[PDB]
């Protein structure tokens, strides 16, 4: 039954027990229920007034940590003889939570998530001699998924009629935006057991309703006579979080961001056929006190 739990529960004292018909330490794993044997029923306990709060394991606290989701370095220079596969003073990024594995395993502890995401953008610059670091203006434009993204630094898509842009400088504090809960469903599917199109040639596991959008970031300045290397780090913090149906954590290393494929490490720990590193026997104690 649902109740409000602010601290961990208290222990009551117990006595010698010797009753027929009552066996609380015996259980039934086969029902799928966890054992309800209390510590008062297994040993003799004392009264403990437990004042240990439980507020740090709240799902709001467990997930609302600003985590790196994007890291992109591009050369900020005059791009005339640069190849067309490079970032000519701007980049595009489809917003995902799959690329960096600390937030990914943490969000994949749940099947469904409903959250607002606040987005911190940290820009840092390095000289590509030394003459000083420029205080450049960057534009981060939020483009929805599948819409027209800019193809140039100076394209006319950067004018942002209805697309939300943030203009920010390197010497400022980092730019911070709140992106709302933007799914067309009532929760994001962290896992999607399906195909996202009506044909049999779509992608497995990728629901585009889960995708936030594109993040097109340019430098508004023109090129200086020297080049610079600009690294843009994007940080996502979930907030106002509801979470449903928890899952086993991922044990094997991630291979891709598109799928849940697995290889495992070559030896234990976290190998395919051995998640926990090995000991000599089942009656061998690894860190035995001498």
């Amino acid at each position: 039954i649902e109740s409000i739990i602010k601290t961990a529960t208290d222990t009551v004292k117990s006595e010698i027990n010797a009753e027929l018909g009552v066996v609380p330490s015996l259980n039934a794993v086969e029902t799928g229920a966890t054992s309800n044997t209390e510590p008062e029923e297994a040993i003799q306990t004392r009264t403990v007034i437990n004042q240990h709060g439980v507020s740090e394991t709240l799902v709001e606290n467990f997930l609302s940590r600003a985590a790196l989701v994007s890291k992109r370095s591009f050369e900020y220079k005059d791009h005339t003889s640069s190849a067309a596969q490079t970032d000519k003073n701007f980049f595009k990024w489809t917003i995902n939570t799959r690329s960096f594995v600390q937030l990914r395993r943490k969000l994949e502890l749940f099947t469904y998530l409903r959250f607002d995401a606040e987005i911190t953008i940290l820009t840092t610059v390095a000289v590509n001699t030394y003459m000083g670091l420029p205080n450049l203006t960057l534009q981060a434009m939020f483009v929805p998924t599948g819409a027209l993204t800019p193809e140039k630094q100076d394209s006319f898509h950067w004018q942002s009629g209805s697309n939300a842009s943030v203009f920010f400088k390197i010497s400022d504090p980092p730019a911070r935006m709140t992106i709302p809960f933007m799914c067309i469903n009532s929760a994001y599917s962290v896992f999607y057991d399906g195909f996202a199109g009506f044909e049999k040639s779509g992608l497995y596991g990728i629901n585009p309703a889960d995708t936030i959008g594109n993040l097109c970031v340019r430098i508004v300045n023109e090129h200086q006579p020297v080049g610079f290397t600009v690294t843009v780090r994007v940080y996502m913090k979930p907030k106002h979080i509801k979470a449903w149906a928890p899952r086993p954590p991922r044990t094997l290393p991630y291979m891709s961001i598109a799928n849940a494929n697995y290889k495992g490490k070559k030896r234990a720990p976290n190998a395919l056929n051995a998640i926990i590193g090995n000991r000599d026997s089942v009656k061998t104690m690894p860190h035995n006190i001498v």
Binding site: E56, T57, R176, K237, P248, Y254, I289
Partner: protein, 247 residues
């Protein structure tokens, strides 16, 4: 105007700060909330669900053979079957559990544990085991005379094929640390050992080697604090197709 002055800590980005920020989409209406089954509001709900221990974390135990302990009929009395190291920080049998994975996001822990053991022999298989918990201090007990002097439960295999060994919170401090020193007095929990109380006695058509499955959950006096990143996941390179999110 209002006379102000900036403090130390002005303009910084703490990753754990709790402020309101600018809406990127004004007058946006989120999707109406639907009831979805199984909402988790505290990660201690997850930690109280029993999950299998890899007690058989040995070589020549490949895959699912690590999730069961094979006991047999013995010809000597008072014999040790298995033992379980109780260090949740350290890569032992308790690491890949629901209580073990969520706790490695934290540094301090407190509260009682429970070990559930399900016997998976035949109906014809009889036997009695003793499941001892030893508070820390000395070595792990290797004989049954030594080990039953601590917290134990004697279990006969019958109509209920399961017991629970409550591992009580017996600590000097309020919390225990997930420090690297497993032999520390702030970290070492103690030992769990299993012995033959009588013997595994089967007839000639039961399989002579039977199995246990060990489970561990946390009780509702369990508590975790001081949050850290998990040592269970990590990368030394970008994942596959991560550059294609920029193309």
């Amino acid at each position: 105007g209002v006379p102000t002055y900036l403090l130390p800590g002005s303009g910084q980005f703490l990753t754990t700060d709790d402020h309101s920020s600018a809406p990127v989409l004004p007058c946006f209406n989120p999707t109406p909330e639907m009831h979805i089954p199984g909402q988790v509001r505290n990660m201690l709900e997850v930690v109280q669900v029993e999950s299998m221990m890899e007690i058989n974390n040995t070589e020549s135990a490949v895959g699912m053979e690590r999730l069961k302990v094979d006991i047999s009929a013995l010809t000597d009395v008072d014999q040790l079957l298995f033992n379980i190291p109780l260090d949740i920080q350290l890569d032992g049998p308790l690491r890949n559990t629901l209580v073990g994975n969520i706790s490695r996001y934290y540094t301090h822990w407190s509260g009682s544990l429970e070990m559930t053991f399900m016997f998976c022999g035949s109906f014809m298989a009889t036997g009695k085991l003793i499941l001892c918990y030893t508070p820390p201090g000395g070595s792990c007990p290797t004989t049954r005379e030594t080990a039953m002097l601590g917290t134990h439960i004697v279990w006969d295999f019958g109509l209920q094929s399961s017991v629970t060994l409550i591992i009580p919170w017996i600590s000097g401090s309020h919390y225990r640390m997930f420090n690297n020193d497993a032999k520390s007095t702030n970290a070492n929990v103690g030992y769990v050992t299993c012995f033959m109380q009588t013997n595994l006695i089967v007839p000639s058509e039961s399989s002579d080697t039977c199995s246990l499955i060990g489970f561990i959950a946390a009780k509702d006096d369990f508590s975790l604090r001081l949050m850290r990143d998990s040592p269970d996941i990590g990368q030394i390179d970008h994942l596959h197709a991560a550059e294609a999110a920029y193309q």
